[PDB]
């Protein structure tokens, strides 16, 4: 029928868990830097 | 539908391949900005500097313990830590702050971890190769070391302590 | 049986996953009490009454590493991406090769077993040098792992005699996976080949009484990560062309999932480095380097993540599926078959950014060698994979034996199935955040209390984990059980095809695909791709050898 809603909303979940980890350690790396 | 959906799923497929790639682009940005930066004095040196294991705490820099620290700049340290079979000498390692600290570090044995808990310093020590790092603890207080590679059954136990001075 | 005459293939497939899956019910015992021993639960004094042979801590951690992660997943894979392009191209595969294979898998799985319960090799399943196990162990790694190069030889077989009868035809798709997979495996596996044929057999024989630590464990390394994409793919296989069927739709595209098999076979071997990063002795250039590559690596995934999600909206819709999240609840919920590899999938979300952040060069100093580490796998092998494994028996268990499967076992795997994610998710949170704290890895910490007060809450699920594991696994083993101990027997449903999925198609597709299908000339690129990556560093190494002789510690 139409846009991957539901896909796209998958891979959204997936680019907001890789920055609150990567961006949250990217953090962490400094503040025992 | 099914080939209607087909274009549309390849179609957005091609832009998150786009904005994935530059995503890591972004992340290889700040790596490399961390790789410039003081920070970037964790990573073991990378030319090789061979050891006997057999012979190491006997002879040379590491076979005493009152000798393990040495002041070789204007405000650069190098000690000299020995990670052994449940242990660290010495015991406790003394440094001052503000001060520039180049470990060297191997082992008699096996592998063990160097982990000095409230830092970036994470190196494995390996037996016959002596792992060269640079570190400024701008905080003063009681560091700790871990061993975080299995090393034998006392491997748990196997802690260290680097007394820095304020 | 007629079945194992006219298809004796599912004979030795079915003779490799049960020896598989025992060793995994093996192994998984010390599960439990390690997620235990992370709540600061010291329950191995229980357990050394229950199985008097186990002598250490690490020794349970051991058996529970090689068990799950070598002899579980290889025996898995080599069933799994030899039956499937078999029955992709209905050719019976080479029997006598095949039979030999398995031999070398039993006997190097009995050959190593030995000295691991009799405490003779309490060296983990990285056996790192110095630590010195008994030659049998080694021996029996080598044969172990040489299995699989008849099999890689095998599916070989089978698809240049496909090439054969239809001459210049694109290489079906199952075949092209299992085949760069296979590849893909054989580049890899030379690293752990090498140090086996030059250091750790010669020197538990005795033959030599040093070995170096530094190169050792990095031709580790070269066979090292590829192996955990080696585990991998058999899953992806099953996950793009079986699943979207079991979720009642079509899998989207064809060329991603070669295009994603093509990527892994070229970029699985030339980044162990990712490993490495607080080891001396090693360029900070070729680290930087390899940490790139690595993130180039974590693409075949993404694009998975897309075509995969895609394939089961499309699915969702087909079912009746909504709006945003409707095609969601649209899936087959009743389906142990189905329902497995999805769940496992979302533990595969909080896992990618895991591995992300790991191969972030420095950032990896934070974590490594941390419980996070754990973390990070656990929700790749022991959540996606092993779950895709379990549920998998669903359709493929009855396909090569006839036994049918019950509304009772069906649900009794649900049970099975949900308990595990959740204890995976649960364990998850657990390692990460210790991790977070500093908390080391291989570590029986419940032996020191107070050497760690600053874990108090994490250390409230590992326990928490520990029990809800330990259900799930008695449950696996009765449910498994059950399963193989009834005599309920169907002929018909033993000759029932394999439930591949629908493959969508497109008009670009062809030019994509016969590019792909150049797998003579790929194989060179990710060959020459290593000795850039490697072979730089390695003969810097190789011409400065100092070995440390070998050592004991349990
Ligand atoms: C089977 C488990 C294996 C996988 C898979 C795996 C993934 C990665 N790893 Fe790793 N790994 C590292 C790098 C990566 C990277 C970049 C990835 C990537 O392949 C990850 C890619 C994944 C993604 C980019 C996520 C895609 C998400 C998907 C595909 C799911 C979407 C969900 C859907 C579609 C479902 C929706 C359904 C609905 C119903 C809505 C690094 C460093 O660079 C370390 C070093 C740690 C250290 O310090 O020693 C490391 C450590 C390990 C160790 C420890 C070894 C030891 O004992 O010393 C093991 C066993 C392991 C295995 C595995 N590893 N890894
Ligand atoms: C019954 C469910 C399981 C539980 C509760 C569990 C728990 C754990 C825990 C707590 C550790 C950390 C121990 C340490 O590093 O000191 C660990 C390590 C490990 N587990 Fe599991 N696990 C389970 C299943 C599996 C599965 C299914 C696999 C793979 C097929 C697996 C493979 C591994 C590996 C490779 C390690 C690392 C050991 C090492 O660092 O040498 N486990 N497991
Ligand atoms: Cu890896
Ligand atoms: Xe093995
Ligand atoms: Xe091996
Ligand atoms: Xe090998
Ligand atoms: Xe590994």
């Given at each position: 029928?139409?846009?991957?809603?539901?896909?796209?909303?998958?891979?959204?979940?997936?680019?907001?868990?890789?920055?609150?980890?990567?961006?949250?350690?990217?953090?962490?790396?400094?503040?025992?830097? | 539908?099914?080939?209607?959906?087909?274009?549309?799923?390849?179609a957005?497929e091609?832009?998150?391949?786009?904005?994935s790639?530059?995503?890591?682009?972004?992340f290889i940005?700040?790596?490399?900005?961390?790789?410039?930066?003081?920070?970037?004095?964790?990573?073991?040196?990378?030319?090789?500097?061979?050891?006997?294991?057999?012979?190491?705490?006997?002879?040379?820099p590491?076979?005493?313990?009152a000798?393990?620290?040495?002041?070789?700049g204007?405000?650069?340290?190098?000690?000299?830590?020995?990670?052994?079979?449940?242990?660290?000498?010495?015991n406790?390692?003394?440094?001052?702050?503000?001060?520039?600290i180049?470990?060297?570090?191997?082992?008699?044995?096996?592998?063990?971890?160097?982990?000095?808990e409230?830092?970036?310093?994470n190196?494995?020590?390996?037996?016959?190769?002596?792992s060269?790092?640079?570190y400024?603890?701008?905080?003063?207080?009681?560091?700790?070391?871990?061993?975080?590679?299995?090393?034998?059954?006392?491997?748990?136990?196997?802690?260290?302590?680097?007394v820095?001075?304020? | 049986?007629?079945?194992?005459?006219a298809?004796?293939?599912?004979?030795?497939?079915?003779?490799?996953?049960?020896?598989?899956?025992?060793?995994?019910?093996?192994?998984?015992?010390?599960?439990?009490?390690?997620?235990?021993?992370?709540?600061?639960?010291?329950?191995?004094?229980?357990?050394?009454?229950?199985?008097?042979?186990?002598?250490?801590?690490?020794?349970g951690?051991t058996?529970?590493?090689?068990?799950?992660?070598?002899?579980?997943?290889?025996?898995?894979?080599?069933?799994?991406?030899?039956?499937?392009?078999?029955?992709?191209?209905?050719?019976?595969?080479?029997?006598?090769?095949?039979?030999?294979?398995?031999?070398?898998?039993?006997?190097?799985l009995?050959?190593?077993?030995?000295?691991?319960?009799?405490?003779?090799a309490?060296?983990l399943?990285?056996?790192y040098?110095?630590?010195?196990?008994?030659w049998?162990?080694?021996?029996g790694?080598?044969?172990?792992?040489?299995?699989?190069?008849?099999?890689?030889?095998?599916?070989?077989?089978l698809?240049?005699?496909?090439?054969?009868?239809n001459?210049?035809?694109?290489?079906?798709?199952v075949?092209?996976?299992?085949?760069?997979?296979?590849?893909?495996?054989?580049?890899?596996?030379?690293?752990?080949?090498?140090?086996?044929?030059?250091?750790?057999?010669?020197?538990?024989?005795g033959?030599?009484?040093?070995?170096?630590?530094?190169?050792?464990?990095?031709?580790?390394?070269?066979?090292?990560?590829?192996?955990?994409?080696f585990?991998?793919?058999?899953?992806?296989?099953?996950?793009?062309?079986?699943l979207?069927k079991?979720?009642?739709?079509?899998?989207?595209?064809?060329?991603?999932?070669?295009?994603?098999?093509?990527?892994?076979?070229?970029?699985?071997?030339?980044?162990?480095?990712?490993?490495?990063?607080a080891?001396?002795?090693?360029?900070?250039?070729?680290?930087?380097?390899?940490?790139?590559?690595?993130?180039?690596?974590?693409?075949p995934?993404?694009?998975?993540?897309?075509?995969?999600?895609?394939?089961?909206?499309?699915?969702?819709?087909?079912?009746?599926?909504?709006?945003?999240?409707?095609?969601?609840?649209?899936l087959?919920?009743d389906?142990?078959?189905?329902?497995?590899?999805?769940l496992?999938?979302?533990?595969?979300?909080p896992?990618?950014?895991?591995?992300?952040?790991?191969?972030?060069?420095?950032?990896?100093?934070?974590?490594?060698?941390?419980?996070?580490?754990?973390?990070?796998?656990?929700?790749?092998?022991?959540?996606?994979?092993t779950?895709?494994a379990?549920?998998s028996?669903?359709?493929?268990?009855?396909?090569?034996?006839?036994?049918?499967?019950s509304?009772?076992?069906?649900?009794?795997?649900?049970?099975?199935?949900?308990?595990?994610?959740?204890?995976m998710?649960?364990?998850?949170?657990?390692?990460?955040?210790?991790?977070?704290?500093?908390?080391?890895?291989?570590a029986?910490?419940?032996q020191?209390?107070?050497?760690?007060?600053?874990?108090?809450?994490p250390?409230?699920?590992?326990?928490?984990?520990?029990?809800?594991?330990?259900?799930?696994?008695?449950?696996?083993?009765?449910?498994?059980?059950?399963?193989?101990?009834?005599?309920?027997?169907?002929?018909?449903?033993?000759?029932?095809?394999?439930?591949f999925?629908?493959?969508?198609?497109?008009?670009?597709?062809?030019?994509?695909?016969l590019?792909?299908?150049?797998?003579?000339?790929?194989?060179?690129?990710?060959?020459?791709?290593?000795?850039?990556?490697?072979g730089?560093?390695?003969?810097?190494?190789?011409?400065?050898?100092?070995?440390?002789?070998?050592?004991?510690?349990?």
């Amino acid at each position: 029928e139409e846009k991957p809603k539901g896909a796209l909303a998958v891979i959204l979940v997936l680019t907001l868990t890789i920055l609150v980890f990567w961006l949250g350690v990217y953090a962490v790396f400094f503040a025992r830097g | 539908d099914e080939h209607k959906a087909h274009k549309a799923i390849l179609a957005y497929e091609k832009g998150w391949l786009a904005f994935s790639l530059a995503m890591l682009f972004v992340f290889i940005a700040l790596i490399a900005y961390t790789l410039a930066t003081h920070t970037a004095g964790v990573i073991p040196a990378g030319k090789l500097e061979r050891v006997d294991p057999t012979t190491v705490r006997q002879e040379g820099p590491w076979a005493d313990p009152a000798q393990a620290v040495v002041q070789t700049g204007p405000n650069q340290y190098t000690v000299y830590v020995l990670a052994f079979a449940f242990g660290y000498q010495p015991n406790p390692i003394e440094v001052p702050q503000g001060a520039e600290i180049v470990f060297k570090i191997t082992s008699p044995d096996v592998i063990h971890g160097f982990h000095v808990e409230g830092t970036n310093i994470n190196v494995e020590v390996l037996p016959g190769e002596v792992s060269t790092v640079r570190y400024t603890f701008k905080r003063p207080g009681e560091y700790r070391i871990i061993c975080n590679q299995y090393c034998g059954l006392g491997h748990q136990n196997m802690f260290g302590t680097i007394v820095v001075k304020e | 049986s007629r079945v194992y005459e006219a298809y004796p293939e599912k004979k030795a497939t079915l003779y490799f996953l049960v020896l598989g899956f025992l060793a995994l019910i093996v192994g998984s015992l010390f599960g439990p009490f390690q997620a235990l021993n992370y709540g600061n639960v010291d329950a191995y004094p229980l357990l050394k009454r229950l199985l008097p042979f186990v002598q250490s801590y690490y020794q349970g951690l051991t058996l529970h590493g090689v068990l799950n992660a070598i002899v579980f997943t290889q025996l898995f894979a080599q069933a799994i991406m030899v039956y499937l392009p078999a029955r992709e191209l209905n050719m019976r595969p080479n029997m006598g090769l095949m039979w030999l294979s398995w031999w070398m898998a039993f006997i190097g799985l009995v050959v190593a077993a030995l000295p691991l319960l009799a405490n003779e090799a309490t060296v983990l399943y990285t056996f790192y040098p110095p630590l010195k196990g008994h030659w049998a162990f080694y021996l029996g790694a080598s044969v172990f792992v040489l299995s699989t190069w008849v099999s890689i030889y095998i599916v070989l077989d089978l698809w240049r005699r496909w090439k054969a009868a239809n001459p210049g035809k694109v290489t079906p798709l199952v075949t092209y996976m299992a085949v760069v997979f296979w590849l893909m495996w054989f580049l890899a596996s030379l690293g752990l080949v090498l140090e086996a044929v030059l250091f750790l057999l010669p020197w538990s024989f005795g033959l030599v009484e040093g070995v170096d630590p530094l190169v050792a464990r990095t031709l580790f390394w070269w066979t090292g990560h590829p192996i955990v994409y080696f585990w991998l793919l058999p899953a992806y296989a099953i996950i793009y062309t079986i699943l979207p069927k079991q979720a009642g739709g079509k899998l989207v595209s064809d060329p991603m999932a070669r295009l994603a098999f093509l990527l892994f076979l070229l970029l699985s071997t030339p980044v162990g480095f990712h490993h490495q990063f607080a080891d001396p002795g090693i360029d900070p250039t070729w680290k930087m380097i390899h940490s790139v590559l690595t993130l180039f690596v974590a693409v075949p995934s993404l694009m998975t993540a897309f075509t995969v999600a895609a394939s089961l909206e499309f699915a969702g819709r087909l079912r009746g599926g909504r709006g945003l999240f409707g095609w969601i609840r649209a899936l087959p919920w009743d389906n142990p078959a189905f329902v497995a590899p999805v769940l496992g999938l979302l533990g595969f979300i909080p896992g990618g950014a895991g591995g992300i952040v790991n191969a972030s060069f420095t950032l990896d100093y934070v974590v490594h060698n941390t419980a996070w580490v754990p973390g990070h796998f656990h929700l790749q092998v022991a959540s996606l994979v092993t779950l895709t494994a379990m549920g998998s028996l669903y359709w493929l268990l009855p396909n090569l034996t006839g036994k049918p499967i019950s509304d009772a076992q069906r649900r009794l795997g649900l049970a099975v199935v949900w308990l595990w994610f959740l204890g995976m998710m649960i364990m998850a949170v657990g390692l990460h955040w210790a991790g977070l704290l500093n908390v080391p890895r291989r570590a029986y910490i419940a032996q020191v209390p107070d050497a760690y007060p600053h874990a108090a809450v994490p250390m409230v699920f590992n326990v928490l984990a520990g029990i809800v594991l330990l259900v799930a696994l008695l449950l696996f083993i009765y449910g498994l059980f059950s399963v193989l101990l009834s005599r309920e027997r169907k002929p018909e449903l033993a000759e029932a095809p394999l439930p591949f999925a629908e493959v969508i198609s497109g008009p670009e597709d062809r030019r994509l695909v016969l590019a792909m299908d150049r797998i003579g000339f790929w194989f060179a690129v990710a060959a020459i791709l290593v000795v850039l990556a490697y072979g730089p560093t390695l003969v810097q190494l190789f011409g400065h050898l100092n070995p440390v002789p070998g050592w004991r510690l349990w």
